[PDB]
Design a protein around this ligand. Structure first.
Ligand SMILES: *[C@@H]1[C@@H](N)[C@H](CO)[C@@H](O)[C@H](O)[C@@H]1O
Ligand SMILES: [Zn+2]
Length: 1014
C-alpha cells in the first residue's frame, strides 16, 4: 500500500497552493469578459497540421427544478428523446449525447417494440452516445460519495441491461463547483475521461493562461498517480451556444440557429443569427473559424470540442432541422476551403477524447497533473455559490437518513433469496431510484421550486417506508426459528423506532411500547448493526411506565436508565420557550451489544416499582419564578433553580461546563487535565438592502454575523448514570448537548419561523492556534486542507460540510461531525462555524425565480470531538489532506449509520432468537462494508452478491489497534463458487480472485467484489 501520510504528491497544479498565489482580480477582459483578447498565429495551421473540430449536440435536462420530474418528462424530455430518435435515424451523420438515465429509462419503457429496436440501433452505431450514464448529473458539494456511487450504478446497470453500453466519458456541465470524489469513483468504475464546467471564473483564466484546462486529476494524497483521470475543464462562463463556439458571445450567439425565425428566442448582444446561404457562407465561416481558432489557443492539441446545446434543447423537429442544416452548410464550405486548414463535423464526447489521446500518443501534448477541488464556485464578481451548501436543510438531513435506510434494507435482505411474492426487489429498486433522483444538482442542493421540493420529499418518504418494510421482513426471517417461520409478506412483524428522524420535536410519531402487569408485561426489541464490527451503543425506546427492566433474550439483566419525555413550547404571554414533561410516556435507555452486520434481541418487562437494574435521571429546570412541573408516574421530582453555570460528567468520559444560557464553555478530557475553553454561540447573517441579494444559490451577507439576543432562556439539565443532557430554548433553536461517556452529541431543533432575510449560524470559539488553516470533507470520503483568504469575501471562505470539519494546532484538535450537509467555515483562528438554516425573501437571478420562504423545522445532529494530537503522526505542513482520528471516525459513523431499532408488533414472538451474526468477522476499525447488495433474483441458478469495501485512513496516535479479524466478504455467504474484483458499479469483472478470497484494500481505497454461489 502507498503511504498517504508521509509522502506529499508532486503535481503541476495543486489547487490550495494556486489559491494562495492568485490575485482573483475581476478585470474586464473585453468580449471574453473574464479572460483576455485571444491571439493565434495563423501559420500554426497548414495542410499537414489541421484543426479537427467536433461539434457535439446536447440538451441539458433537469430531473426536477422549475417543474417536477414527471412534468418535465411529459412537457419537454419525452419530445426531445422522440425527436432525437427520429432525426438521428433519418440523418446518420447527426450525433447527440445524453446524460440523465432517469429520463432515458422512463422514455424507453414507454416505446413500442419497433421504436425500441430503432433506439438500440442508433446507440449501437454510436450516433446517440451516453455520457456518464448516471441516474442524474449529481450535485458534487452536498452529496455523500455512497449516493454518488448509488446513482451512477442505477443508471449504468440500466444501460448495460437494455442498451448493452457502459460509458467511459463523464459530462458534468451544471453542478455548482466540482469535487475530486467524482474522478475517484469514475476511475474505479472503468472511466477514462471526464468533463467539468462550473469553476471559478478566475481559475478558468489562470488555467487557460497556462493551457492547463486539460489535466490528469489525481487525489490529493496519491503520490503514485494511479487515481488520475483525464479531465477537460470548459473555458467560458456557460455551456450555452453563445459561450461554447469561442470567446466572443456576440459572434457565437449568431450560430445558435434557434434564435431566429418563429421560436420566440433572440440574442442579448442584438445581432441575430442568419440562415447560411451561398451568398453569406464565406463571411459567416470567416467569423466562426476565427472563434474556433481562438478557443483552440487555450488547449494543447489540434482537436477542438465545440458543444452545441442548452437547457431542454432539441425539443422540436424544426429545431433539429435548423441547427443541423445550417451547420452542415458551414461544414461543407469550411472543409472544402484549404485556406482554413480545418476539418469540422458533428461528433460525440468519446470521439473528442479518443482523438485528443491519439494526438497525445503522437507527441503533440504532455498534459499537466492536478490535485484539489473546485469549491467555492463564483460565476461573476463576488457572487459565490455557498448558499446551496445550506438551502432546504430539512431535505439535506433526509438525504442522510434515506442513505442509511437504503444501506440497511439492501444488507438485511441480502442474506437470503426472496420469493417474488415478497416484492423485496420492487421496494429496493423504488428506494434506490428515489434516493438517486435526489442527488440531482437541484435536489439535495435545495435549489428547486417549492412544489418540486414537495415531490422530492414525498418520493423520499415513500422510499423510507419501502426500506422499513424490507428491513422488518428481513429481521423476522433472520431471528425466527425455521420450524416456526411461515411469513405473510404483507404483514408488519416489527415497527422501526427512529429517535433522530424526523425527531420527536419535529413529528411526534414514535410508538410508545404499552406494557401492563396483567395484559402485556413484556416486549421484544431488536437492534441491527450495519457496520462490520461489534458495536455497543445506547439505544432508547418510549414506554408507557417508568418501572421497566431490560434483559437479553437469555434473561441476563441489562443496566438501564429511565428519563422523562420533554417537549418545548412557545408561551405567547412571556415569549419564553419552555419545556413540558409527559405524564404518560418515558424513555428507557440501555446499551445494546450488536454483532458485526448483525442483530441482537432484548426484552423490556414492566414491574410495580423501581426495578433492581434501572436508574432514574434527575431533572433540574433553571428559570426564575418557577411554576410546578409534574411527570405522572416518574419517581423523581423535578428540581428548580435560577440560571447558573453547570458541569456534567458521564462515566469516566469528559467533563463539560455550560454557561447560565445552557451553552458549552469548556471540556476537560480527564480528571487531571486542563479545562479547555470551547464556547458554543449562535449568530445571524443578514442580506444586502442595496446590491446583490442572497437566494437559494448565493450567500451575500451584509458583513460579519451579529450576536443574537437570547434573553434569559430556560435551561433543562437531565442527569443520569448512562445519559445526561443540557437543553436550552433559544429563539429559533432548541439546543441540546447530550453526554453518554465520550464525545458529546449536539442536537439543534431549528425553526427559523418567519425571520425573513436571516441565516442562523452556530459558531465554536476556542484558543486552538489554527491561524488561517481548517479542514472540511468532500462527500464524506476525504478531508481537504482549507486556507481562509482575507483577499476573498466572507462567502468565498464558506465550504461544504458534507460530514465534518476540524481545526488544530501542534497540541489540540477540535472536530465537528455532522449528520447532514451544511455550509461552514473557520473565519478566525480557533473558530469553527456551520449554518443551520436560511430564509431569503429575494430571488438571486440564477433561474429559480423564487427566494427561500418554505422553511420547516429540522433536527440537525452533530458530534464534537476535542482531542490531544501531539502524539499523532501527522502529514507534513505541505500535504493538502487531513485525516480523522479513530474517535472522530467512530463519531461520524454514529451519526451516519447508527443502530437500527425494531419493536415486535404482536403480543407473542414464537421462535424468537437472541442474535444473528455472532460469527461474522469484526473487521479493523478503518474498514467498512459500504454496500452489500444481492445482484440476482431467486430464479437465478448462480446467486451473486456484491460488496463495496472502503478503507479510510486514520491518524496513528500511538494507541495500538487491538485484536481484529480478517474480513473476506466472499465467504460471508455459504457455497461460494467464485469471487471477482469488479468495478464499483459491479458491471465489469476485473480479477478472478485466488482462493475465492476478497483481499482487504489499502488506506483511502474502495474496491468492489462479487461472490457467486451454487
Ligand atoms: C443549470 C443552471 N443554470 C441552474 C442554476 O443557474 C440550475 O439550478 C439548473 O440545474 C439548470 O439546469
Ligand atoms: Zn441543471
Amino acid at each position: 500500500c502507498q503511504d498517504v501520510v508521509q509522502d506529499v504528491p508532486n503535481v503541476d497544479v495543486q489547487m490550495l497552493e494556486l489559491y494562495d498565489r492568485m490575485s482573483f482580480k475581476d478585470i474586464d477582459g473585453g468580449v471574453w469578459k473574464q479572460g483576455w483578447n485571444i491571439k493565434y498565429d495563423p501559420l500554426k495551421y497548414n495542410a499537414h497540421h489541421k484543426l479537427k473540430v467536433f461539434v457535439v449536440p446536447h440538451s441539458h435536462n433537469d430531473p426536477g427544478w422549475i417543474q417536477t420530474f414527471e412534468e418535465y418528462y411529459q412537457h419537454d424530455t419525452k419530445h426531445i428523446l422522440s425527436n432525437a430518435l427520429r432525426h438521428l435515424h433519418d440523418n446518420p451523420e447527426m450525433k447527440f449525447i445524453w446524460a440523465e438515465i432517469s429520463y432515458f429509462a422512463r422514455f424507453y419503457h414507454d416505446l413500442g417494440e419497433n421504436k425500441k429496436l430503432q433506439m438500440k440501433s442508433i446507440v449501437k452505431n454510436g450516433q446517440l452516445e451516453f455520457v456518464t450514464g448516471g441516474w442524474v448529473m449529481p450535485d458534487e458539494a452536498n452529496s455523500h460519495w455512497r449516493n454518488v456511487l448509488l446513482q451512477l450504478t442505477e443508471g449504468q446497470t440500466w444501460l448495460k441491461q437494455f442498451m448493452n453500453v457502459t460509458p467511459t466519458a463523464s459530462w458534468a456541465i451544471d453542478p455548482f463547483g466540482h469535487s475530486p470524489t467524482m474522478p475517484y469513483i469514475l476511475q474505479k468504475s472503468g472511466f477514462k475521461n471526464m468533463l467539468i464546467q462550473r469553476t471559478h471564473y478566475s481559475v478558468k483564466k489562470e488555467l487557460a493562461q497556462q493551457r492547463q484546462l486539460e489535466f490528469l486529476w489525481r487525489q490529493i494524497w496519491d503520490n503514485k498517480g494511479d487515481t488520475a483521470l483525464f479531465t477537460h475543464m470548459m473555458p467560458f462562463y456557460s455551456y450555452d451556444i453563445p459561450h461554447t463556439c469561442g470567446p466572443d458571445p456576440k459572434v457565437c450567439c449568431q450560430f445558435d440557429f434557434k434564435r431566429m425565425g418563429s421560436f420566440g428566442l433572440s440574442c442579448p448582444w442584438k445581432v441575430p443569427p442568419r440562415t447560411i446561404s451561398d451568398q453569406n457562407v464565406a463571411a459567416r465561416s470567416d467569423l466562426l473559424v476565427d472563434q474556433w481558432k481562438k478557443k483552440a489557443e487555450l488547449y494543447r492539441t489540434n482537436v477542438l470540442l465545440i458543444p452545441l446545446g442548452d437547457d431542454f434543447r432539441f425539443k422540436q423537429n424544426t429545431e433539429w432541422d435548423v441547427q443541423r442544416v445550417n451547420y452542415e452548410r458551414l461544414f461543407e464550405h469550411i472543409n472544402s476551403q484549404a485556406h482554413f486548414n480545418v476539418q469540422a463535423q458533428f461528433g460525440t464526447l468519446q470521439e473528442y477524447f479518443d482523438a485528443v489521446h491519439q494526438a497525445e500518443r503522437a507527441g503533440q501534448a504532455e498534459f499537466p497533473t492536478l490535485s484539489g477541488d473546485f469549491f467555492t464556485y463564483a460565476d461573476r464578481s463576488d457572487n459565490y455559490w455557498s448558499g446551496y451548501y445550506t438551502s432546504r436543510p430539512y431535505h439535506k438531513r433526509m438525504d442522510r437518513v434515506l442513505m442509511h435506510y437504503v444501506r440497511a434494507a439492501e444488507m438485511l435482505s441480502a442474506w437470503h433469496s426472496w420469493d417474488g411474492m415478497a416484492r423485496i426487489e420492487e421496494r429496493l429498486e423504488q428506494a434506490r431510484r428515489e434516493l438517486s433522483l435526489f442527488q440531482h444538482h437541484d435536489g439535495i442542493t435545495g435549489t428547486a421550486k417549492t412544489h418540486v421540493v414537495v415531490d422530492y420529499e414525498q418520493r423520499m418518504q415513500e422510499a423510507l417506508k419501502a426500506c422499513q418494510m424490507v428491513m422488518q421482513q428481513s429481521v423476522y426471517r433472520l431471528l425466527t426459528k425455521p420450524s416456526i417461520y411461515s411469513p405473510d409478506f404483507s404483514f408488519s412483524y416489527f415497527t422501526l423506532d427512529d429517535s433522530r428522524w424526523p425527531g420527536s420535536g419535529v413529528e411526534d410519531s414514535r410508538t410508545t411500547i404499552i406494557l401492563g402487569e396483567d395484559i402485556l408485561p413484556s416486549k421484544h426489541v431488536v437492534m441491527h448493526n450495519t457496520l462490520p464490527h461489534w458495536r455497543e451503543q445506547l439505544v432508547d425506546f418510549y414506554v408507557s411506565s417508568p418501572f421497566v427492566s431490560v434483559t437479553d433474550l437469555a434473561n441476563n439483566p441489562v443496566e438501564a436508565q429511565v428519563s422523562p419525555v420533554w417537549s418545548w413550547h412557545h408561551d405567547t404571554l412571556t415569549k419564553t420557550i419552555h419545556p413540558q414533561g409527559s405524564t404518560t410516556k418515558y424513555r428507557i435507555i440501555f446499551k445494546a451489544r450488536v454483532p458485526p452486520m448483525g442483530l441482537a434481541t432484548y426484552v423490556l418487562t414492566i414491574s410495580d416499582s423501581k426495578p433492581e437494574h434501572t436508574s432514574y435521571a434527575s431533572n433540574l429546570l433553571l428559570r426564575k419564578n418557577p411554576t410546578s412541573l409534574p411527570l405522572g408516574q416518574y419517581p423523581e421530582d423535578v428540581k428548580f433553580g435560577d440560571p447558573r453555570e453547570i458541569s456534567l460528567r458521564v462515566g469516566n468520559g469528559p467533563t463539560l461546563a455550560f454557561s447560565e444560557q445552557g451553552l458549552l464553555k469548556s471540556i476537560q478530557l480527564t480528571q487531571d487535565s486542563p479545562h479547555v475553553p470551547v464556547h458554543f454561540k449562535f449568530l445571524k447573517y443578514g442580506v444586502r438592502s442595496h446590491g446583490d441579494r442572497s437566494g437559494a444559490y448565493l450567500f451575500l451577507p451584509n458583513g460579519p454575523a451579529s450576536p443574537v439576543e437570547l434573553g434569559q432562556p430556560v435551561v433543562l439539565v437531565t442527569k443520569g448514570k448512562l445519559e445526561s443532557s443540557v437543553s436550552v430554548g433559544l429563539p429559533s433553536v432548541v439546543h441540546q448537548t447530550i453526554m453518554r461517556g465520550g464525545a458529546p452529541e449536539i442536537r439543534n431543533l431549528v425553526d427559523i419561523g418567519s425571520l425573513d432575510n436571516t441565516e442562523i449560524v452556530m459558531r465554536l470559539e476556542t484558543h486552538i492556534d489554527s491561524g488561517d488553516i481548517f479542514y472540511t470533507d468532500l462527500n464524506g470520503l476525504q478531508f481537504i486542507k482549507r486556507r481562509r483568504l482575507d483577499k476573498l469575501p466572507l462567502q468565498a471562505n464558506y465550504y461544504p460540510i458534507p460530514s465534518g470539519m476540524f481545526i488544530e494546532d501542534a497540541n489540540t484538535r477540535l472536530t465537528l461531525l455532522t449528520g447532514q450537509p451544511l455550509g461552514g467555515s473557520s473565519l478566525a483562528s480557533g473558530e469553527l462555524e456551520i449554518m443551520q438554516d436560511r430564509r431569503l425573501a429575494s430571488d438571486d437571478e440564477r433561474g429559480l425565480g423564487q427566494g427561500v420562504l418554505d422553511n420547516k423545522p429540522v433536527l440537525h445532529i452533530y458530534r464534537l470531538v476535542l482531542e490531544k494530537v501531539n502524539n499523532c503522526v501527522r502529514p507534513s505542513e505541505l500535504h493538502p489532506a487531513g485525516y480523522l482520528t479513530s474517535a472522530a471516525h467512530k463519531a461520524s459513523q454514529s451519526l451516519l449509520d447508527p443502530l437500527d431499532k425494531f419493536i415486535f408488533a404482536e403480543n407473542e414472538w414464537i421462535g424468537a432468537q437472541g442474535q444473528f451474526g455472532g460469527d461474522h468477522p469484526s473487521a479493523r476499525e478503518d474498514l467498512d462494508v459500504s454496500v452489500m447488495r444481492r445482484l440476482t433474483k431467486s430464479s437465478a441458478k448462480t446467486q451473486r452478491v456484491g460488496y463495496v469495501l472502503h478503507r479510510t485512513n486514520l491518524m496513528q496516535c500511538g494507541t495500538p489497534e487491538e485484536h481484529t479479524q480478517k474480513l473476506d466478504v466472499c465467504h460471508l455467504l455459504p457455497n461460494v463458487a467464485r469471487c471477482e474484483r469488479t468495478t464499483l458499479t459491479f458491471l465489469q469483472n476485473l480479477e478472478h480472485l485466488d482462493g475465492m478470497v476478497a483481499p482487504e484494500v489499502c488506506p483511502m481505497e474502495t474496491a468492489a467484489y462479487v461472490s457467486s454461489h451454487s
